[PDB]
């Protein structure tokens, strides 16, 4: 809405500037504006969208955890609960915004495996963030929505992408985190991380130096989690 009067190219340019200035709220607003122009996003533009919202929700999640921890230790007036609720509502708002962009209409216009997997991974992640704070009647549905998005992404990535593809690797990492932290399925988490790592290792020989760097970075993050989990 507010970005309706600005050129798409200007919104992208300003998103990049906002990133350099570490103004992630601005960056997210610019990229929301760019998405709402209705055109598909390039690879670089998808990354800008992801970076922007990851930083915004990242800060909110960190704040929520601080407040939640204080709240649990307190169990004094209603202020901690009230403020935790405030941050929670704001977080849910951002997640809903991202999910809204994915549903209107990024996913349905995403035909290439790379774009579709990227957006479905995002969908899984933002349902996962909703799941982290969920308690009510729709908690199980939120979890299943995350699961469903991740699963579709996994199915496509396995068919259409090499096992070293960074998006495929990052998807597997985050889906494994979903299993461990949300779905109470640590064995599934470990299995997924292990198989992902091993299948990537076997395909490294096909890669250039630059691609090798990117793939091995994410492989190390998988290994880091396996080390923590075992």
């Amino acid at each position: 809405g507010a970005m309706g009067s600005m050129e798409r190219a200007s919104l992208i340019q300003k998103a990049k500037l906002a990133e350099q200035a570490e103004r992630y709220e601005d960056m997210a607003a610019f990229m929301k504006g760019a998405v709402e122009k209705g055109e598909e996003l390039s690879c670089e533009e998808r990354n800008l969208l992801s970076v922007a919202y990851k930083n915004v929700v990242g800060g909110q999640r960190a704040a929520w955890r601080v407040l939640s921890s204080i709240e649990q230790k307190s169990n004094k007036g209603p202020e901690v609960r009230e403020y935790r609720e405030k941050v929670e509502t704001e977080l849910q708002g951002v997640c809903d915004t991202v999910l809204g962009l994915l549903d209107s209409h990024l996913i349905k216009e995403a035909g290439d495996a790379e774009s579709r997997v990227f957006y479905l991974k995002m969908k899984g992640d933002y349902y996962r963030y909703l799941a982290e704070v969920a308690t009510g009647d729709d908690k199980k549905r939120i979890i299943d929505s995350a699961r469903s998005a991740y699963q579709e992404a996994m199915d496509i990535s396995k068919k259409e992408m090499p096992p070293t593809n960074p998006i495929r690797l990052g998807l597997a990492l985050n889906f494994s985190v979903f299993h461990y932290e949300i779905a109470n399925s640590p064995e599934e988490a470990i299995s997924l991380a292990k198989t992902t790592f091993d299948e990537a290792m076997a395909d490294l020989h096909t890669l250039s130096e630059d691609s090798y760097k990117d793939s091995t970075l994410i492989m190390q993050l998988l290994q880091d989690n396996l080390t923590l989990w075992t």
Partner: peptide, 8 residues
């Protein structure tokens, strides 16, 4: 918690 994917 466990680390998920960071920014690139």
């Amino acid at each position: 918690r466990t680390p998920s994917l960071p920014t690139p």
